[PDB]
C-alpha cells in the first residue's frame, strides 16, 4: 500500500510492474470502479472520467514491463486510491495531493507577520515543518503562521510537509 | 426515438498511421488518383 505525495501543479508517476514482458493488458480504476486508462492491443483508450485531457502513458515502456501513469497539472480533486490489474493482481497505490502557499501576493512590509494557507484533502492531517535559512525551524500542524517577517527573513522559506513519514518540500514567495 | 433513406458519413484518408503490431508511427506513399469505391457487409459489433 505505497502512498505518494503531490504538489498541486507538478507531475507524478504511479507505476505498476510485471514480469512477463509481453505488453499485456492492464487498467487504472479509481476508488469508484471507473476506468481512466488501459492498453487495447497497442493503442490507448482514455476512460470516460474527469481526467480526460490530463492522463497519458509512456508508450515506449509497455514492452519492458512497466506501465506508468503520468498525470500532468494535478488538482486537489484527484487525491484518491488507484489499482493496477496487470495480469491478475490488485497492486494498489494511494495518492495525496495538496498545496501550501501564501495569501499576500507582493505587498509586504518589514516588521509584520507571515501566514501560510495549506489546502489538504478533507480527512487528512499533514504536519507542517518549516525550515528556513535563518534557522527558524517553526513546527506546527496543518496551519502555521509566522509573527515576524523582517528583511533578514528574505528568501523562500522551506516549510516541508510530512505525512506518514513522507516529506515534501515547498517554497514561499516573500516580497518586501 | 431515432428518426421520424440515407445516412452520410464523412471520410478523410490518411498517410501517417500508427502500427497495430507494436508501438511506433509509420508513413506510406501518396494516395491514388480517384474513383475509389467499397461495398461491404456488416455482421457483428464489438462494444
Amino acid at each position, epitope marked *: 500500500k505505497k502512498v505518494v505525495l503531490g504538489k498541486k501543479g507538478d*507531475t507524478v508517476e504511479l507505476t505498476c510492474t510485471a514480469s512477463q514482458k509481453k505488453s499485456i493488458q492492464f487498467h487504472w480504476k479509481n476508488s469508484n470502479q471507473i476506468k481512466i486508462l488501459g492498453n487495447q492491443g497497442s493503442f490507448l483508450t482514455k476512460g470516460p472520467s474527469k481526467l480526460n*485531457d490530463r492522463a*497519458d502513458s509512456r508508450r*515506449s515502456l509497455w514492452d519492458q514491463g512497466n506501465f506508468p501513469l*503520468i498525470i*500532468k497539472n494535478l488538482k486537489i480533486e484527484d487525491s484518491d486510491t488507484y489499482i493496477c490489474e496487470v495480469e491478475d493482481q490488485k497492486e494498489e497505490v494511494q495518492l495525496l495531493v495538496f498545496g501550501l502557499t501564501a495569501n499576500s501576493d507582493t505587498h509586504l512590509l518589514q516588521g509584520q507577520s507571515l501566514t501560510l494557507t495549506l489546502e489538504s484533502p478533507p480527512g487528512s492531517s499533514p504536519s507542517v515543518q518549516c525550515r528556513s535559512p535563518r534557522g527558524k525551524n517553526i513546527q506546527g500542524g496543518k496551519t502555521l503562521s509566522v509573527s515576524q517577517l523582517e528583511l533578514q527573513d528574505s528568501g523562500t522559506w522551506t516549510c516541508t510537509v510530512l505525512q506518514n513519514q513522507k516529506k515534501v518540500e515547498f517554497k514561499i514567495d516573500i516580497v518586501v | 426515438t431515432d428518426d421520424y433513406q440515407n445516412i452520410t458519413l464523412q471520410c478523410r484518408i490518411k*498517410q*501517417i498511421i500508427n502500427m497495430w503490431q507494436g508501438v*511506433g*508511427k509509420a*508513413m506510406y*506513399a*501518396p494516395p491514388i488518383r480517384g474513383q475509389i469505391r467499397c461495398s461491404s457487409n456488416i455482421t457483428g459489433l464489438l462494444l
Partner: antibody
Amino acid sequence: QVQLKQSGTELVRPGTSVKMSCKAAGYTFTDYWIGWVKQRPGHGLEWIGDFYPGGDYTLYSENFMGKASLTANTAYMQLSSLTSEDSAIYYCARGHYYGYSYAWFAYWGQGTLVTVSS
Amino acid sequence: DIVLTQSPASLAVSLGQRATISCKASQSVDYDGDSYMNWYQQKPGQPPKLLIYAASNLESGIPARFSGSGSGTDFTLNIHPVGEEDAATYYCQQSHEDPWTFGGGTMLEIKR
C-alpha cells in the same frame, strides 16, 4: 482539423520578462512537439526552441541561451532580458514525437506582434 | 551548422510559365536514401504555409501544380502553371540534423 490561435499584440518595455500564449484547438496535443518561431524583417524567420508537452521536454538552439524559456492544451513562452532587437513577430507550430517531430509536420499558426519600445 | 543558399535572389516569371527555384546545401542531409527538404511559401500579411515536404511527397489541399526534385546538396522546387496568386517568397529548409537552420528566401513576382 488542427488550428492554432495566438493572443493579441503586445507592447512591452525592454529588459523585462514577456509572457506569450498560444492556445491549441480540438486535438490531443499530447504526442506533438511545439516549435516557437521569431520573424524579423530582412532576416527570413528563425526558431527559438521546441517544447514537448508529453514530458515537458526542451530542445534549444545555440543562439538563445539564457534568453528563451519554454513551458507547457495551452503552451506559453518565457523570454528574459528583452531588448529592442526582439521587437518582431512570433509564431507557434505543431508537430509530433517519437522522432521526426518536425521532419514532416504541417499546419502552421497565425502569429502575434511584440514591440519593445519605451 | 549547415548553411543553405537559395537561388536566385530575385526572379521574373511570365504567366503560364514553368518556375524553378534552386537550393544548395553545405553538408549532406541524406539518411537512408531520403531527402529531408521542406518548402514553404510566404505572402505579405499572412503567415507561412507548409508547401511541400520530403521533396518527394506532396501535401493535401495544395493543388498538384507543384513538385520537388534533386539530390544531396542540390534541390529544385518547380511550379506549373504559374498563376496570379503565386506572387510570394519561397523558403527551402533542412530537417535532417539540428540546429534548425534557414536560407535567405527567394522572391517571385508574376510578370504580365
